[PDB]
């Protein structure tokens, strides 16, 4: 909320540029003048209470992981400190590279080479499973929350070092806590249908993330609940009967079916740009297919019967990493 370059925060950090913006506010690269000049990333949070207590939660999550895993072994972003600055909350992070979304974005939305996807997939899975081990759900996993450590590339840009870290913990919730409904192009189905969530909804996102690394685009491109539900079914097949029945938000559930118009102009938009999952493959080579096996397991409709990351890390697709 209106900052600028060359500025100084809390008499220590000097803004050099802006790494990105969001509804919460922004992230800037600074020079830390009281730590020898190290570049760091600083998250300045708009002074709206909604974002202010998200930030406060985030700080306690970040402090938990940071003490439990001070080595960043499990690759969750490291918080260096926080402060207040004219009513704005500021969180200081280790400085990292581009988002995976941003990197793809500036590469013509070319996808990642499968061997890079594998190492990325492994680290995300391993990192979030850590959160999962500690009674935490991220709820907000997306390609934009996964950043390369160094995002240098050769060039059709080829990424040098696919090492990543997992970042935004504003939304992360403990099991010991009340389970929200916030708002998003990667929400699990047990989330849209207001049926309760927990660790298995992180796994859903990871599936969606891995389709995107593979194709270079998303396959659930709509911030509309109905459109999404229909996309889900064209790609993954029929929604389980029981979930449709035991849903509080039983608005678009007519005669126990999805009350969507396959016949409407908007319907054709859903059909014209979505096919069954396995039709998205671009090779039928063995390792392409191990991957889609994993993705299909991750995209199981029933969170109760959905693969866990503890399992996912043992899947065939990762064998070459061993
Ligand atoms: O939320 C965090 O924990 C969080 C923590 C660290 C970074 C971050 C978000 N976002 C960066 N980039 C970014 C890119 C686009 C939009 C926005 Cl808002 C931010 C970034 C860059 C370099 N080093 C650390 C970070």
Numbering used by the authors: 149 to 303, 313 to 340, 343 to 481
Verbatim from the authors:
CLKs are dual-specificity kinases that are activated by autophosphorylating their own tyrosine residues and subsequently phosphorylate the serine/threonine residues of the SR protein. Later, CX-4945 was revealed to have a strong inhibitory activity on CLKs; IC50 values of 82.3 nM (CLK1), 3.8 nM (CLK2), and 90.0 nM (CLK3). In order to elucidate the selective inhibitory effect of CX-4945 on CLKs, we determined the structures of CLK1, CLK2, and CLK3 in complex with CX-4945. The overall structure of the CLK catalytic domain contained 12 β-strands and 10 α-helices that could be divided into the N-lobe and C-lobe, which are typical forms of the kinase.
